[PDB]
Protein backbone atom coordinates (compact mmCIF):
# COMPACT_ATOMS: atom_id res chain seq x y z
CA UNK A 1 0.00 0.00 0.00
CA UNK A 2 2.96 2.37 0.27
CA UNK A 3 3.23 5.36 -2.02
CA UNK A 4 5.44 4.88 -5.05
CA UNK A 5 5.35 1.09 -4.68
CA UNK A 6 5.20 -0.52 -8.11
CA UNK A 7 2.70 -3.34 -8.31
CA UNK A 8 1.00 -2.37 -5.07
CA UNK A 9 -2.70 -2.84 -4.58
CA UNK A 10 -3.54 0.71 -5.68
CA UNK A 11 -1.61 0.23 -8.91
CA UNK A 12 -3.66 -2.88 -9.68
CA UNK A 13 -6.86 -1.06 -8.71
CA UNK A 14 -5.98 1.68 -11.18
CA UNK A 15 -5.15 -0.84 -13.91
CA UNK A 16 -8.41 -2.75 -13.44
CA UNK A 17 -10.96 -0.08 -12.46
CA UNK A 18 -9.34 3.32 -12.98
CA UNK A 19 -7.14 5.85 -11.20
CA UNK A 20 -10.19 7.50 -9.65
CA UNK A 21 -11.12 4.23 -7.98
CA UNK A 22 -7.47 3.93 -6.94
CA UNK A 23 -7.67 7.30 -5.19
CA UNK A 24 -10.96 6.32 -3.55
CA UNK A 25 -9.39 3.09 -2.29
CA UNK A 26 -6.32 4.98 -1.06
CA UNK A 27 -8.55 7.24 1.01
CA UNK A 28 -10.66 4.35 2.30
CA UNK A 29 -7.70 2.21 3.35
CA UNK A 30 -6.04 5.26 4.90
CA UNK A 31 -9.14 5.85 7.01
CA UNK A 32 -9.24 2.19 8.07
CA UNK A 33 -5.61 2.34 9.20
CA UNK A 34 -6.03 5.70 10.92
CA UNK A 35 -9.07 4.56 12.91
CA UNK A 36 -7.42 1.28 13.87
CA UNK A 37 -4.50 3.29 15.23
CA UNK A 38 -6.95 5.69 16.88
CA UNK A 39 -8.07 2.70 18.91
CA UNK A 40 -4.73 0.87 19.06
CA UNK A 41 -2.30 3.73 19.66
CA UNK A 42 1.28 4.11 18.47
CA UNK A 43 4.29 5.94 19.86
CA UNK A 44 8.07 6.19 19.96
CA UNK A 45 9.92 6.56 23.25
CA UNK A 46 13.43 7.32 24.42
CA UNK A 47 13.58 3.76 25.78
CA UNK A 48 12.67 2.37 22.36
CA UNK A 49 16.12 3.49 21.21
CA UNK A 50 18.00 2.52 24.39
CA UNK A 51 20.07 -0.66 24.29
CA UNK A 52 20.16 -3.14 27.12
CA UNK A 53 23.50 -3.23 28.98
CA UNK A 54 24.36 -6.63 27.51
CA UNK A 55 23.54 -5.28 24.06
CA UNK A 56 25.68 -2.22 24.76
CA UNK A 57 28.62 -4.46 25.65
CA UNK A 58 28.01 -6.42 22.45
CA UNK A 59 28.00 -3.20 20.41
CA UNK A 60 31.24 -2.23 22.13
CA UNK A 61 32.70 -5.62 21.22
CA UNK A 62 31.75 -5.25 17.55
CA UNK A 63 33.23 -1.77 17.35
CA UNK A 64 36.34 -3.02 19.17
CA UNK A 65 36.75 -5.71 16.51
CA UNK A 66 36.43 -3.05 13.81
CA UNK A 67 39.08 -0.94 15.52
CA UNK A 68 41.23 -4.04 16.03
CA UNK A 69 41.40 -4.86 12.34
CA UNK A 70 41.99 -1.16 11.65
CA UNK A 71 44.90 -1.23 14.09
CA UNK A 72 46.16 -4.37 12.37
CA UNK A 73 46.26 -2.39 9.13
CA UNK A 74 48.12 0.31 11.06
CA UNK A 75 50.59 -2.26 12.41
CA UNK A 76 51.24 -3.52 8.89
CA UNK A 77 51.85 0.10 7.89
CA UNK A 78 54.27 0.57 10.79
CA UNK A 79 56.55 -2.25 9.62
CA UNK A 80 56.30 -1.14 5.99
CA UNK A 81 54.20 -4.17 5.06
CA UNK A 82 51.62 -2.17 3.07
CA UNK A 83 52.44 -2.96 -0.56
CA UNK A 84 49.88 -1.28 -2.84
CA UNK A 85 48.93 -2.93 -6.13
CA UNK A 86 49.97 -1.31 -9.38
CA UNK A 87 48.35 2.00 -10.26
CA UNK A 88 47.88 2.87 -6.59
CA UNK A 89 50.09 4.62 -4.06
CA UNK A 90 50.59 3.52 -0.46
CA UNK A 91 48.45 6.40 0.83
CA UNK A 92 45.52 5.50 -1.42
CA UNK A 93 45.81 1.77 -0.70
CA UNK A 94 46.01 2.35 3.05
CA UNK A 95 43.00 4.67 2.97
CA UNK A 96 41.16 2.02 0.95
CA UNK A 97 42.01 -0.64 3.53
CA UNK A 98 40.87 1.54 6.42
CA UNK A 99 37.65 2.51 4.62
CA UNK A 100 36.81 -1.11 3.84
CA UNK A 101 37.79 -2.29 7.32
CA UNK A 102 35.71 0.20 9.34
CA UNK A 103 32.34 -0.94 7.99
CA UNK A 104 29.60 -2.09 10.35
CA UNK A 105 28.98 -5.84 9.94
CA UNK A 106 25.50 -7.28 9.56
CA UNK A 107 26.02 -8.69 13.06
CA UNK A 108 25.52 -5.18 14.49
CA UNK A 109 21.77 -5.78 14.28
CA UNK A 110 21.96 -8.60 16.84
CA UNK A 111 22.24 -6.32 19.91
CA UNK A 112 19.84 -3.79 18.38
CA UNK A 113 17.29 -6.55 17.82
CA UNK A 114 17.94 -8.02 21.27
CA UNK A 115 17.14 -4.68 22.91
CA UNK A 116 14.07 -4.24 20.72
CA UNK A 117 10.64 -5.81 21.21
CA UNK A 118 9.36 -5.87 17.61
CA UNK A 119 5.71 -6.30 18.61
CA UNK A 120 5.81 -3.05 20.59
CA UNK A 121 8.88 -1.04 19.51
CA UNK A 122 7.54 2.00 17.70
CA UNK A 123 10.85 2.95 16.11
CA UNK A 124 11.46 -0.57 14.83
CA UNK A 125 7.94 -0.83 13.43
CA UNK A 126 8.30 2.51 11.65
CA UNK A 127 11.65 1.44 10.19
CA UNK A 128 10.65 -2.11 9.25
CA UNK A 129 7.30 -1.43 7.58
CA UNK A 130 8.84 1.21 5.33
CA UNK A 131 6.76 3.99 6.88
CA UNK A 132 9.86 6.05 7.70
CA UNK A 133 13.55 5.52 8.34
CA UNK A 134 15.97 2.76 7.48
CA UNK A 135 18.34 0.32 9.13
CA UNK A 136 21.21 2.86 8.89
CA UNK A 137 19.08 5.32 10.87
CA UNK A 138 18.40 2.73 13.57
CA UNK A 139 22.07 1.73 13.70
CA UNK A 140 23.15 5.37 14.02
CA UNK A 141 20.61 6.03 16.77
CA UNK A 142 21.33 2.89 18.80
CA UNK A 143 24.68 1.23 18.01
CA UNK A 144 27.05 3.71 16.38
CA UNK A 145 27.61 6.22 13.58
CA UNK A 146 30.69 4.60 12.08
CA UNK A 147 33.06 6.13 9.57
CA UNK A 148 32.26 9.65 8.37
CA UNK A 149 33.02 9.71 4.65
CA UNK A 150 33.10 12.83 2.47
CA UNK A 151 33.50 12.11 -1.26
CA UNK A 152 34.03 8.40 -0.47
CA UNK A 153 37.05 9.10 1.73
CA UNK A 154 37.77 9.84 5.38
CA UNK A 155 38.36 13.30 6.82
CA UNK A 156 41.47 14.58 5.07
CA UNK A 157 44.04 16.28 7.32
CA UNK A 158 43.08 19.89 6.60
CA UNK A 159 43.85 21.43 10.01
CA UNK A 160 47.59 21.38 9.35
CA UNK A 161 50.17 19.22 7.63
CA UNK A 162 49.09 15.79 8.85
CA UNK A 163 46.44 16.89 11.38
CA UNK A 164 42.67 16.56 11.15
CA UNK A 165 41.88 18.55 14.30
CA UNK A 166 43.66 20.26 17.16
CA UNK A 167 42.34 17.39 19.28
CA UNK A 168 44.48 14.81 17.49
CA UNK A 169 48.26 14.65 17.10
CA UNK A 170 50.12 14.97 13.84
CA UNK A 171 50.37 11.66 11.97
CA UNK A 172 47.82 10.10 14.31
CA UNK A 173 47.14 6.59 13.05
CA UNK A 174 44.10 5.61 15.13
CA UNK A 175 40.82 5.48 13.23
CA UNK A 176 38.89 7.98 15.36
CA UNK A 177 41.25 10.77 14.29
CA UNK A 178 40.07 10.59 10.68
CA UNK A 179 36.31 10.56 11.17
CA UNK A 180 35.36 7.22 12.71
CA UNK A 181 32.56 7.94 15.18
CA UNK A 182 32.27 5.16 17.73
CA UNK A 183 29.47 6.55 19.90
CA UNK A 184 25.85 6.27 18.89
CA UNK A 185 23.52 9.25 18.88
CA UNK A 186 21.70 8.02 21.99
CA UNK A 187 25.04 7.58 23.77
CA UNK A 188 26.09 11.13 22.92
CA UNK A 189 28.96 12.08 20.64
CA UNK A 190 32.15 13.51 22.10
CA UNK A 191 33.54 16.83 20.89
CA UNK A 192 35.72 15.65 17.95
CA UNK A 193 33.04 13.15 16.94
CA UNK A 194 30.44 15.92 16.88
CA UNK A 195 32.86 18.07 14.88
CA UNK A 196 33.22 15.35 12.25
CA UNK A 197 29.47 14.77 12.20
CA UNK A 198 28.96 18.49 11.69
CA UNK A 199 31.44 18.42 8.81
CA UNK A 200 29.37 15.68 7.19
CA UNK A 201 26.07 17.47 7.81
CA UNK A 202 27.37 20.74 6.39
CA UNK A 203 28.55 18.85 3.32
CA UNK A 204 25.05 17.42 2.91
CA UNK A 205 23.46 20.87 3.18
CA UNK A 206 25.87 22.29 0.59
CA UNK A 207 25.18 19.36 -1.73
CA UNK A 208 21.44 19.95 -1.50
CA UNK A 209 21.83 23.64 -2.34
CA UNK A 210 23.99 22.70 -5.34
CA UNK A 211 21.40 20.13 -6.39
CA UNK A 212 18.66 22.75 -6.55
CA UNK A 213 20.79 25.40 -8.25
CA UNK A 214 22.29 23.13 -10.92
CA UNK A 215 19.10 21.23 -11.73
CA UNK A 216 17.72 24.68 -12.48
CA UNK A 217 19.92 25.37 -15.50
CA UNK A 218 19.97 21.71 -16.54
CA UNK A 219 16.17 21.52 -16.62
CA UNK A 220 15.78 24.82 -18.45
CA UNK A 221 18.29 23.92 -21.17
CA UNK A 222 16.73 20.48 -21.63
CA UNK A 223 13.21 21.95 -21.78
CA UNK A 224 14.16 24.51 -24.41
CA UNK A 225 15.98 21.86 -26.42
CA UNK A 226 13.05 19.44 -26.42
CA UNK A 227 10.00 21.71 -26.18
CA UNK A 228 9.18 21.80 -29.90
Amino acid sequence: VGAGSSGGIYHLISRRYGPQQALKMIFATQQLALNYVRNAGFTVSTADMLLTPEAHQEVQEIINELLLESEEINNRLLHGDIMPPIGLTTHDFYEKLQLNALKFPDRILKPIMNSINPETNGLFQMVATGAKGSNPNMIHIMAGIGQIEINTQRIQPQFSFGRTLVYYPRFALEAQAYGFICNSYIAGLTSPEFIFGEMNGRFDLINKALSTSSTGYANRKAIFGLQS
Binding site: E61, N64, D81, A187
Partner: protein, 184 residues
Amino acid sequence: KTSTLIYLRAYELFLKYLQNAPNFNSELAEFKTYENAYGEQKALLAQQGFYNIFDPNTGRADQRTRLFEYKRLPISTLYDERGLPHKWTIYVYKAVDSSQKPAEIEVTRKDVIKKIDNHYALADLRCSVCHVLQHEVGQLNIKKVQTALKASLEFNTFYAFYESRCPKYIIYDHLSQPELVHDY
Protein backbone atom coordinates in the same frame (compact mmCIF):
# COMPACT_ATOMS: atom_id res chain seq x y z
CA LYS B 1 12.66 51.71 49.82
CA THR B 2 15.99 50.80 48.24
CA SER B 3 14.45 50.70 44.77
CA THR B 4 12.94 54.14 45.38
CA LEU B 5 16.39 55.45 46.30
CA ILE B 6 17.94 53.87 43.20
CA TYR B 7 15.24 55.22 40.88
CA LEU B 8 15.37 58.79 42.15
CA ARG B 9 19.17 58.87 42.33
CA ALA B 10 19.34 57.54 38.78
CA TYR B 11 17.02 60.31 37.60
CA GLU B 12 19.11 62.90 39.45
CA LEU B 13 22.26 61.57 37.81
CA PHE B 14 20.51 61.71 34.43
CA LEU B 15 19.69 65.37 35.06
CA LYS B 16 23.25 66.03 36.25
CA TYR B 17 24.64 64.52 33.05
CA LEU B 18 22.26 66.63 30.96
CA GLN B 19 23.28 69.85 32.75
CA ASN B 20 26.94 68.74 33.03
CA ALA B 21 27.33 68.97 36.79
CA PRO B 22 31.00 69.32 37.83
CA ASN B 23 31.86 66.06 39.62
CA PHE B 24 29.61 63.87 37.51
CA ASN B 25 32.15 61.14 36.70
CA SER B 26 33.08 59.94 40.19
CA GLU B 27 29.47 60.19 41.36
CA LEU B 28 28.47 58.11 38.35
CA ALA B 29 31.16 55.58 39.29
CA GLU B 30 29.93 55.15 42.86
CA PHE B 31 26.29 55.04 41.75
CA LYS B 32 27.29 52.44 39.16
CA THR B 33 28.72 50.36 42.00
CA TYR B 34 25.49 50.76 43.98
CA GLU B 35 23.38 49.88 40.93
CA ASN B 36 25.59 46.84 40.37
CA ALA B 37 24.89 45.64 43.91
CA TYR B 38 21.16 46.28 43.53
CA GLY B 39 21.12 44.53 40.15
CA GLU B 40 22.81 41.52 41.70
CA GLN B 41 20.17 41.44 44.43
CA LYS B 42 17.46 41.71 41.76
CA ALA B 43 19.14 38.87 39.86
CA LEU B 44 18.71 36.74 42.96
CA LEU B 45 14.95 37.27 42.65
CA ALA B 46 15.21 35.98 39.05
CA GLN B 47 16.70 32.59 39.91
CA GLN B 48 14.29 29.69 39.40
CA GLY B 49 16.56 26.99 40.84
CA PHE B 50 18.91 24.44 39.34
CA TYR B 51 19.22 20.76 40.24
CA ASN B 52 22.18 18.48 39.53
CA ILE B 53 21.59 14.75 39.19
CA PHE B 54 24.08 13.34 41.68
CA ASP B 55 25.95 10.08 41.36
CA PRO B 56 24.99 8.05 44.46
CA ASN B 57 28.50 6.58 44.68
CA THR B 58 30.25 9.96 44.39
CA GLY B 59 28.20 12.84 45.74
CA ARG B 60 28.87 15.11 42.76
CA ALA B 61 27.49 15.61 39.26
CA ASP B 62 26.60 12.35 37.54
CA GLN B 63 29.69 11.40 35.53
CA ARG B 64 28.51 7.90 34.59
CA THR B 65 28.13 7.53 30.83
CA ARG B 66 27.48 4.79 28.30
CA LEU B 67 30.16 6.11 25.95
CA PHE B 68 32.38 3.81 23.91
CA GLU B 69 35.67 2.62 25.41
CA TYR B 70 38.49 1.33 23.24
CA LYS B 71 39.34 -1.99 24.95
CA ARG B 72 41.86 -3.61 22.61
CA LEU B 73 40.89 -7.23 21.91
CA PRO B 74 42.79 -10.42 21.06
CA ILE B 75 43.26 -11.05 17.36
CA SER B 76 41.45 -14.41 17.46
CA THR B 77 38.19 -12.41 17.58
CA LEU B 78 38.70 -11.59 13.88
CA TYR B 79 40.54 -14.56 12.36
CA ASP B 80 40.86 -18.31 12.79
CA GLU B 81 43.92 -20.35 13.69
CA ARG B 82 44.59 -20.49 9.92
CA GLY B 83 44.55 -16.71 9.49
CA LEU B 84 41.27 -16.46 7.64
CA PRO B 85 38.66 -13.88 8.69
CA HIS B 86 35.63 -15.15 10.56
CA LYS B 87 32.38 -15.30 8.58
CA TRP B 88 29.60 -15.29 11.19
CA THR B 89 26.98 -16.59 8.78
CA ILE B 90 25.68 -19.82 10.38
CA TYR B 91 23.16 -19.00 13.10
CA VAL B 92 22.81 -21.36 16.06
CA TYR B 93 19.39 -21.81 17.65
CA LYS B 94 18.45 -23.51 20.91
CA ALA B 95 15.06 -24.71 22.11
CA VAL B 96 13.87 -22.84 25.20
CA ASP B 97 11.72 -25.77 26.33
CA SER B 98 13.38 -29.03 27.36
CA SER B 99 11.02 -31.25 25.33
CA GLN B 100 11.47 -29.89 21.78
CA LYS B 101 13.81 -32.65 20.62
CA PRO B 102 15.61 -30.92 17.70
CA ALA B 103 17.09 -28.66 20.40
CA GLU B 104 20.04 -27.28 18.42
CA ILE B 105 19.51 -25.97 14.89
CA GLU B 106 22.28 -24.34 12.85
CA VAL B 107 20.89 -22.43 9.88
CA THR B 108 21.69 -19.87 7.20
CA ARG B 109 19.92 -16.50 7.23
CA LYS B 110 17.70 -17.44 4.28
CA ASP B 111 16.60 -20.78 5.77
CA VAL B 112 15.76 -19.29 9.19
CA ILE B 113 12.17 -18.45 8.28
CA LYS B 114 11.79 -21.89 6.69
CA LYS B 115 13.12 -23.82 9.68
CA ILE B 116 12.96 -21.86 12.96
CA ASP B 117 9.77 -21.06 14.87
CA ASN B 118 8.73 -19.29 18.08
CA HIS B 119 9.66 -22.26 20.29
CA TYR B 120 13.35 -21.46 19.72
CA ALA B 121 15.85 -18.85 20.87
CA LEU B 122 19.09 -17.69 19.29
CA ALA B 123 22.46 -18.52 20.82
CA ASP B 124 25.87 -17.34 19.67
CA LEU B 125 26.58 -17.41 15.94
CA ARG B 126 28.83 -19.95 14.24
CA CYS B 127 31.75 -19.25 11.93
CA SER B 128 31.20 -20.86 8.53
CA VAL B 129 34.94 -21.17 7.81
CA CYS B 130 36.50 -22.54 11.01
CA HIS B 131 33.29 -23.75 12.74
CA VAL B 132 33.92 -21.87 15.99
CA LEU B 133 31.12 -20.38 18.07
CA GLN B 134 31.01 -16.61 18.43
CA HIS B 135 31.15 -16.80 22.22
CA GLU B 136 33.89 -19.44 21.99
CA VAL B 137 36.41 -17.26 20.13
CA GLY B 138 38.50 -17.00 23.30
CA GLN B 139 39.20 -20.72 23.05
CA LEU B 140 41.48 -20.04 20.08
CA ASN B 141 45.21 -19.61 20.70
CA ILE B 142 46.50 -16.09 20.05
CA LYS B 143 50.02 -17.15 19.01
CA LYS B 144 48.78 -19.54 16.33
CA VAL B 145 46.34 -16.97 14.93
CA GLN B 146 49.02 -14.27 14.83
CA THR B 147 51.63 -16.50 13.19
CA ALA B 148 49.11 -17.77 10.63
CA LEU B 149 48.04 -14.21 9.85
CA LYS B 150 51.60 -12.94 9.38
CA ALA B 151 52.59 -15.95 7.26
CA SER B 152 49.47 -15.57 5.12
CA LEU B 153 50.12 -11.85 4.66
CA GLU B 154 53.71 -12.51 3.59
CA PHE B 155 52.45 -15.13 1.14
CA ASN B 156 49.81 -12.70 -0.14
CA THR B 157 52.39 -10.01 -0.86
CA PHE B 158 54.75 -12.52 -2.48
CA TYR B 159 52.01 -13.84 -4.76
CA ALA B 160 50.88 -10.29 -5.55
CA PHE B 161 54.36 -9.33 -6.74
CA TYR B 162 55.01 -12.51 -8.76
CA GLU B 163 51.69 -12.93 -10.58
CA SER B 164 53.64 -13.14 -13.85
CA ARG B 165 57.26 -12.47 -12.92
CA CYS B 166 59.97 -15.05 -12.11
CA PRO B 167 62.20 -15.02 -9.01
CA LYS B 168 65.30 -15.22 -11.21
CA TYR B 169 48.03 -18.70 -7.44
CA ILE B 170 44.72 -17.13 -6.41
CA ILE B 171 43.43 -19.34 -3.54
CA TYR B 172 46.60 -20.57 -1.74
CA ASP B 173 44.75 -23.46 -0.06
CA HIS B 174 47.02 -26.22 -1.39
CA LEU B 175 49.46 -25.74 1.53
CA SER B 176 53.08 -26.88 2.04
CA GLN B 177 53.69 -26.00 -1.61
CA PRO B 178 53.63 -22.24 -0.87
CA GLU B 179 56.21 -22.81 1.87
CA LEU B 180 58.71 -24.43 -0.50
CA VAL B 181 58.04 -21.79 -3.16
CA HIS B 182 58.39 -18.89 -0.71
CA ASP B 183 61.63 -20.19 0.80
CA TYR B 184 62.97 -20.93 -2.70
